[PDB]
C-alpha cells in the first residue's frame, strides 16, 4: 500500500516540450514530444500521420472537461499535465488491435 503525490512549477522554459496521451479507447499512457511554440495541430501532424490518424479523427481534451481543446493552442499550454485521446469508433489502419463489441 502507501501511496503519495507531488506538485510541480510552472516557469518560462524555451525548449522542446513534451506531455503524455491518454489512449482511452486503448490502455496505455504515451508520451508526444514536440516544439512549443508549434500547435497542437502542427505537434500531432507527425504523430496523425506517423500513426495513420488525422487531426479530424482524433479529438484532444484533458481529462474531466466539457469540450475538446483546441489544437491551434501551442503544445507550451499542454507540457504540465496529462492530455486524453477520444479516437474515432473505427479504426482499420492503425498498429496494434485490441478492441470489443457493446450493446446496450
Known amino acids: 500500500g502507501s501511496s503519495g503525490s507531488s506538485g510541480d512549477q510552472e516557469v518560462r522554459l524555451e525548449n522542446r516540450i513534451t506531455f503524455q496521451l491518454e489512449l482511452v479507447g486503448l490502455e496505455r ?3 508526444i514530444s514536440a516544439k512549443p511554440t508549434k500547435r497542437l495541430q502542427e505537434a500531432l ?3 496523425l500521420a506517423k500513426h495513420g490518424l488525422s487531426l479530424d479523427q ?3 481534451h484533458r ?4 469540450q475538446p481543446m483546441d489544437l491551434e493552442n501551442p503544445v507550451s499550454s499542454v507540457a504540465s499535465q496529462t492530455l486524453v485521446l477520444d479516437t ?3 479504426a482499420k489502419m492503425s498498429e496494434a488491435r485490441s478492441s470489443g463489441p457493446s450493446s446496450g
Open 88 to 90: 474515432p469508433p473505427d
Open 29 to 31: 499512457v504515451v508520451r
Open 63 to 66: 481529462p474531466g472537461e466539457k
Open 58 to 60: 482524433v479529438v484532444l
Open 45 to 47: 501532424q507527425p504523430i
